[PDB]
Protein backbone atom coordinates (compact mmCIF):
# COMPACT_ATOMS: atom_id res chain seq x y z
CA UNK A 1 0.00 0.00 0.00
CA UNK A 2 1.27 3.21 -1.13
CA UNK A 3 0.38 6.54 0.59
CA UNK A 4 0.51 9.56 -0.67
CA UNK A 5 -0.30 13.32 0.71
CA UNK A 6 -2.83 15.63 -1.50
CA UNK A 7 -2.00 18.79 -3.31
CA UNK A 8 -1.67 21.86 -0.42
CA UNK A 9 -4.92 22.77 -2.49
CA UNK A 10 -7.16 19.87 -3.05
CA UNK A 11 -6.64 19.39 0.73
CA UNK A 12 -8.05 22.67 1.00
CA UNK A 13 -11.04 22.15 -1.11
CA UNK A 14 -11.90 18.61 0.62
CA UNK A 15 -11.31 20.48 4.48
CA UNK A 16 -13.83 23.04 2.90
CA UNK A 17 -16.19 20.23 1.75
CA UNK A 18 -16.01 18.83 5.20
CA UNK A 19 -16.39 21.37 7.16
CA UNK A 20 -18.87 23.99 5.78
CA UNK A 21 -22.25 24.00 6.95
CA UNK A 22 -24.63 23.17 3.44
CA UNK A 23 -27.54 21.01 3.40
CA UNK A 24 -27.95 20.16 0.12
CA UNK A 25 -25.63 17.22 0.50
CA UNK A 26 -27.89 15.25 -2.18
CA UNK A 27 -25.29 16.70 -5.03
CA UNK A 28 -23.17 14.67 -4.74
CA UNK A 29 -25.03 11.69 -6.43
CA UNK A 30 -25.56 14.14 -9.29
CA UNK A 31 -21.63 14.85 -9.74
CA UNK A 32 -20.91 10.93 -9.32
CA UNK A 33 -23.27 10.13 -12.52
CA UNK A 34 -21.53 12.67 -14.60
CA UNK A 35 -18.74 11.61 -14.46
CA UNK A 36 -19.77 8.20 -14.61
CA UNK A 37 -21.28 9.28 -17.58
CA UNK A 38 -18.21 11.09 -18.69
CA UNK A 39 -16.49 7.79 -18.76
CA UNK A 40 -18.49 6.06 -20.78
CA UNK A 41 -18.48 8.90 -23.29
CA UNK A 42 -15.23 8.28 -23.27
CA UNK A 43 -14.76 4.25 -23.56
CA UNK A 44 -17.36 4.66 -26.51
CA UNK A 45 -16.15 7.10 -28.67
CA UNK A 46 -11.85 5.61 -28.24
CA UNK A 47 -13.99 2.16 -29.45
CA UNK A 48 -15.05 3.91 -32.76
CA UNK A 49 -11.18 3.83 -33.90
CA UNK A 50 -9.89 0.76 -31.99
CA UNK A 51 -13.16 -1.65 -31.11
CA UNK A 52 -11.06 -3.86 -29.17
CA UNK A 53 -11.14 -1.65 -26.57
CA UNK A 54 -14.89 -2.92 -25.45
CA UNK A 55 -13.16 -6.45 -25.78
CA UNK A 56 -13.00 -5.96 -21.59
CA UNK A 57 -16.59 -5.67 -21.89
CA UNK A 58 -19.53 -4.10 -24.38
CA UNK A 59 -21.83 -3.08 -21.95
CA UNK A 60 -22.20 0.74 -21.21
CA UNK A 61 -24.42 1.12 -17.83
CA UNK A 62 -24.18 3.36 -14.35
CA UNK A 63 -25.72 0.56 -11.11
CA UNK A 64 -26.32 2.47 -8.03
CA UNK A 65 -25.86 -0.21 -5.66
CA UNK A 66 -27.10 0.63 -1.25
CA UNK A 67 -25.78 -1.83 1.36
CA UNK A 68 -27.44 -0.97 4.77
CA UNK A 69 -25.25 -3.67 6.48
CA UNK A 70 -22.13 -2.37 5.55
CA UNK A 71 -23.65 1.63 5.38
CA UNK A 72 -22.09 2.22 1.73
CA UNK A 73 -23.98 3.42 -1.36
CA UNK A 74 -21.47 2.41 -4.71
CA UNK A 75 -21.55 3.73 -7.86
CA UNK A 76 -20.21 1.30 -10.54
CA UNK A 77 -19.99 2.19 -14.40
CA UNK A 78 -18.72 0.83 -17.30
CA UNK A 79 -16.81 3.95 -18.35
CA UNK A 80 -12.94 4.21 -19.54
CA UNK A 81 -11.73 3.90 -15.90
CA UNK A 82 -8.60 5.18 -14.30
CA UNK A 83 -4.91 4.04 -14.63
CA UNK A 84 -2.74 4.29 -11.84
CA UNK A 85 -1.10 7.80 -12.89
CA UNK A 86 -4.65 9.03 -13.02
CA UNK A 87 -5.35 8.29 -9.43
CA UNK A 88 -1.89 9.60 -8.37
CA UNK A 89 -1.31 12.48 -10.00
CA UNK A 90 -3.32 13.28 -13.29
CA UNK A 91 -6.67 13.70 -12.27
CA UNK A 92 -5.82 16.23 -8.96
CA UNK A 93 -3.19 18.05 -11.34
CA UNK A 94 -6.18 18.71 -13.94
CA UNK A 95 -8.43 19.41 -10.63
CA UNK A 96 -5.94 22.51 -9.39
CA UNK A 97 -7.34 25.18 -11.55
CA UNK A 98 -11.30 24.42 -11.11
CA UNK A 99 -10.25 24.43 -7.20
CA UNK A 100 -8.94 27.57 -7.39
CA UNK A 101 -11.60 29.15 -9.25
CA UNK A 102 -14.00 27.47 -7.48
CA UNK A 103 -12.57 28.89 -4.09
CA UNK A 104 -12.85 32.16 -5.29
CA UNK A 105 -16.33 31.78 -7.16
CA UNK A 106 -17.70 30.68 -3.05
CA UNK A 107 -16.07 33.55 -1.61
CA UNK A 108 -17.34 35.96 -4.36
CA UNK A 109 -21.26 34.28 -3.68
CA UNK A 110 -21.12 31.02 -5.44
CA UNK A 111 -22.65 27.80 -3.67
CA UNK A 112 -21.11 24.45 -3.46
CA UNK A 113 -23.75 23.24 -5.87
CA UNK A 114 -21.85 24.73 -8.41
CA UNK A 115 -18.70 22.71 -8.14
CA UNK A 116 -19.29 20.42 -11.12
CA UNK A 117 -19.15 23.65 -13.45
CA UNK A 118 -15.55 23.61 -11.96
CA UNK A 119 -14.76 19.99 -12.98
CA UNK A 120 -14.13 19.22 -9.45
CA UNK A 121 -17.48 17.53 -8.64
CA UNK A 122 -15.89 14.19 -7.33
CA UNK A 123 -14.51 15.84 -4.16
CA UNK A 124 -18.28 16.73 -3.47
CA UNK A 125 -18.27 12.51 -2.01
CA UNK A 126 -17.40 13.89 1.02
CA UNK A 127 -20.13 16.12 2.12
CA UNK A 128 -21.88 12.23 2.90
CA UNK A 129 -18.97 10.00 2.86
CA UNK A 130 -16.78 9.59 6.14
CA UNK A 131 -14.13 7.61 3.50
CA UNK A 132 -13.97 6.77 0.48
CA UNK A 133 -12.73 4.14 -1.58
CA UNK A 134 -12.27 3.95 -5.89
CA UNK A 135 -12.23 0.71 -7.17
CA UNK A 136 -10.98 1.27 -11.17
CA UNK A 137 -9.84 -0.76 -14.01
CA UNK A 138 -8.64 1.42 -17.75
CA UNK A 139 -7.51 -0.84 -20.49
CA UNK A 140 -3.55 0.10 -20.51
CA UNK A 141 -3.43 -0.87 -16.29
CA UNK A 142 -3.92 -3.30 -14.27
CA UNK A 143 -6.99 -3.13 -11.19
CA UNK A 144 -6.44 -0.35 -8.44
CA UNK A 145 -7.98 0.72 -5.30
CA UNK A 146 -7.52 4.31 -4.19
CA UNK A 147 -8.83 5.26 -0.60
CA UNK A 148 -9.32 8.34 1.24
CA UNK A 149 -10.65 9.77 4.72
CA UNK A 150 -9.28 13.22 4.03
CA UNK A 151 -6.99 14.57 6.34
CA UNK A 152 -4.77 15.23 3.43
CA UNK A 153 -3.19 11.46 2.65
CA UNK A 154 -4.58 9.16 0.21
CA UNK A 155 -4.03 5.42 -0.43
CA UNK A 156 -3.18 3.33 -3.74
CA UNK A 157 -2.83 -0.41 -3.89
CA UNK A 158 -3.21 -2.94 -6.38
CA UNK A 159 -6.82 -4.72 -5.63
CA UNK A 160 -6.30 -8.44 -5.48
CA UNK A 161 -10.88 -8.32 -5.17
CA UNK A 162 -13.21 -9.11 -8.16
CA UNK A 163 -12.08 -8.11 -11.49
CA UNK A 164 -14.12 -6.23 -12.86
CA UNK A 165 -12.94 -5.69 -16.46
CA UNK A 166 -12.95 -2.19 -16.99
CA UNK A 167 -14.48 0.84 -15.45
CA UNK A 168 -15.02 2.30 -12.04
CA UNK A 169 -16.51 2.07 -8.52
CA UNK A 170 -16.43 4.61 -5.99
CA UNK A 171 -17.83 3.06 -2.25
CA UNK A 172 -19.20 5.92 -0.18
CA UNK A 173 -18.82 5.02 2.96
CA UNK A 174 -21.25 7.23 4.14
CA UNK A 175 -21.64 9.07 7.60
CA UNK A 176 -23.95 8.16 10.60
CA UNK A 177 -26.39 10.91 9.83
CA UNK A 178 -26.55 10.48 5.93
CA UNK A 179 -27.95 7.00 6.05
CA UNK A 180 -30.46 8.69 3.89
CA UNK A 181 -28.75 8.28 0.70
CA UNK A 182 -29.54 4.12 1.40
CA UNK A 183 -32.99 4.41 0.84
CA UNK A 184 -34.63 3.43 -2.55
CA UNK A 185 -36.60 5.83 -2.35
CA UNK A 186 -34.79 8.61 -1.94
CA UNK A 187 -32.11 7.94 -4.47
CA UNK A 188 -35.08 7.07 -6.85
CA UNK A 189 -35.88 10.88 -6.11
CA UNK A 190 -32.33 12.83 -6.69
CA UNK A 191 -31.79 10.86 -10.21
CA UNK A 192 -35.09 11.92 -11.32
CA UNK A 193 -34.40 15.18 -10.20
CA UNK A 194 -30.54 15.78 -11.33
CA UNK A 195 -29.55 13.21 -13.49
CA UNK A 196 -33.17 12.94 -15.93
CA UNK A 197 -31.48 12.88 -19.08
CA UNK A 198 -28.25 10.69 -18.71
CA UNK A 199 -28.08 8.57 -22.11
CA UNK A 200 -26.63 5.13 -20.19
CA UNK A 201 -29.14 3.16 -18.74
CA UNK A 202 -28.78 3.42 -14.98
CA UNK A 203 -29.81 0.78 -12.31
CA UNK A 204 -30.78 1.68 -8.52
CA UNK A 205 -30.47 -1.95 -6.93
CA UNK A 206 -32.43 -3.28 -4.49
CA UNK A 207 -31.36 -4.53 -0.80
CA UNK A 208 -31.90 -7.98 -0.13
C1 LIG B 1 -10.28 14.36 -9.50
C2 LIG B 1 -10.88 12.98 -9.44
N1 LIG B 1 -12.02 12.79 -10.13
N2 LIG B 1 -12.64 11.59 -10.14
C3 LIG B 1 -12.10 10.56 -9.44
CL1 LIG B 1 -12.94 9.05 -9.49
C4 LIG B 1 -10.92 10.68 -8.71
C5 LIG B 1 -10.36 9.61 -8.00
C6 LIG B 1 -9.20 9.78 -7.30
C7 LIG B 1 -8.57 11.00 -7.29
C8 LIG B 1 -9.10 12.07 -7.98
C9 LIG B 1 -10.28 11.92 -8.70
MG1 LIG C 1 -3.86 15.77 -5.30
Excluded at 36 to 59: F, Q, V
Excluded at 101 to 126: C, N, P, R, T
Aim: proline share 2%.
Amino acid sequence: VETFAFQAEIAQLMSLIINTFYSNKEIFLRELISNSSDALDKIRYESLTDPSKLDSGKELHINLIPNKQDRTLTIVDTGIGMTKADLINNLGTIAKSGTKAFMEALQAGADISMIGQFGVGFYSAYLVAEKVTVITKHNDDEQYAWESSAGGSFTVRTDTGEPMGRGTKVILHLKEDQTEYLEERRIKEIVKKHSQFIGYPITLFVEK
